[PDB]
Amino acid sequence: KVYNDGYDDDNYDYIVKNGEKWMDRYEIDSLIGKGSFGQVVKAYDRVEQEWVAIKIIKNKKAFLNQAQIEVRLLELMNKHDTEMKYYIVHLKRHFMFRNHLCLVFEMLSYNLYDLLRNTNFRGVSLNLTRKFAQQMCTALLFLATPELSIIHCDLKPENILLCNPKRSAIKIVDFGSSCQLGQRIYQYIQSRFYRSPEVLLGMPYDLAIDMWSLGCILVEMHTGEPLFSGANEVDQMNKIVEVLGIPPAHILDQAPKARKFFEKLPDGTWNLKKTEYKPPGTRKLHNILGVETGGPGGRRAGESGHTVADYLKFKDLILRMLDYDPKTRIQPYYALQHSFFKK
Ligand SMILES: COc1ccc2c(c1)[nH]c1c(C)nccc12
Predict the structure, then answer these.
(1) CATH superfamily of 82-88+108-343
(2) Among 173, 304, 313, 321, who pairs with 340 as Cys (CB 3.0-4.6 Å)?
(3) How far is the CA of 333 from the centre of ligand 1 (A)?
(4) Across the chain, how many H-helices and E-strands are there?
């Protein structure tokens, strides 16, 4: 069996060969990423004299269409004045090559998960976390401009990359799962650890689900561990409940999947159901962040910029992002005015 004249493997992926050169322009270096969409390779652009990252989409109509949506949104974004657009990875161009759709992006550095692995999952300082947070909020602000109304849908450490391994500037990548504010066709979305309550509950969702994700990410950048690391949806909701309590009644009364996690008592109130979890609301974020005990594992005592005052402003911003009600969950514009960023 031969695939795409020998260029593809059985998984519809282009067989990457180091040193090969395409269209007498790009010189392939090495594979730097895999995913259900296909692969990501580091290449050198002879014409522009620069390094670029090329995303080679699998040779399958299903994935090809997924990518065309990504191209559309990217082109739509990169057609907007503001410098806010500079927190979104830039698509230089795209072309079909040997039946594969290729997207050429500016070359970037490590993703934040890699960064967390180098701290051996102990986290980065509160000051570095603040820099990331401010950029992330500005990116979400940009995705929220009316004409765009883009929901990334897959924010997580792996999709936030540093521009330069020395500087702290970051960029959001991978809009393959993104959509514009529209109609809840799909329901099983976002990576589990960062899945918002409304998605878990099967309710309508909008741009707010990205802010919930951000909150989970910030806490994880600082503590070094996922705030809610469920092994499945039920375990995921229970871990969320340990920290924020039972969701408000008005929300559960409309949750199509509420009875998958809770039970409505004969009196109208809700409680966790059957089946290792501290009581609702007993696992305070105050303690998780170590506000009064020198940060996570007390490993931040004496470190400049880690006073109780600082930690409080951080605990506050996070709680405003992890609000159960998507209607009152803090939006990008105001998060940026929060006293946590106040100089
Ligand atoms: C290592 O540098 C990059 C630059 C752009 C992207 C990248 C890695 N990974 C991407 C993915 C998974 N999607 C769109 C753009 C990129």
Answers:
(1) Transferase(Phosphotransferase) domain 1 (1.10.510.10)
(2) 313
(3) 27
(4) 10, 12
Cα 1 from Cα 302, distance rounded (Å): 64
Joined tokens for residue 233: 């949806």
Q: Catalytic residue at 253?
A: no
Chain center to CA of 257: 24
Architecture of domain 1-81+89-107: 2-Layer Sandwich (3.30)
For the chain, give percent helix, strand, coil, nearest 5: 35, 20, 45
- How far apart are the C-alpha atoms of 300 and 126, rounded to whole Å? 9
The distance from CA 303 to its chain's CA centroid, rounded to whole angstroms, is 28
Beta bridge partners of 104: 54, 93
- Cβ atoms of residues 7 and 15 within 8 Å: yes
Sequence-distant (≥ 6) Cβ neighbours of residue 182 within 8 angstroms: none
* Positions of chain breaks in the chain, given as the residue before each break (C to N > 2.5 Å): 275
Residue 335 Cβ < 6 Å to ligand 1 = no
> Measured between alpha carbons, how far is 343 from 127 in angstroms, rounded to an integer?
12
Of 94, 105, 115, the one to substitute when testing ligand 1's pocket (max ligand atoms within 8 A of C-beta) is 105
Experimental method, per PDB record: X-ray
The answer on whether 262 is annotated among ligand-binding residues is no
CA atoms within a 13 Å half-sphere pointing along the CA-CB vector of 76: 19
Of 123, 174, 167, 161, nearest in space to 306 by CA: 123
What 3-state class would DSSP assign to 81?
coil
Which residues are bridge partners to 94 per DSSP? 103
Structure tokens at 235: 């375990």
Catalytic residue among 8, 154, 174, 210: 154
Domain ranges of the chain: 1-81+89-107, 82-88+108-343
Q: Which two tokens stand for residue 173?
A: 């990548």
Give, as one character, the DSSP assignment of residue 185. -
Please tell me the distance from the alpha carbon of residue 277 to that of residue 275, in angstroms, as a whole number. Answer: 10
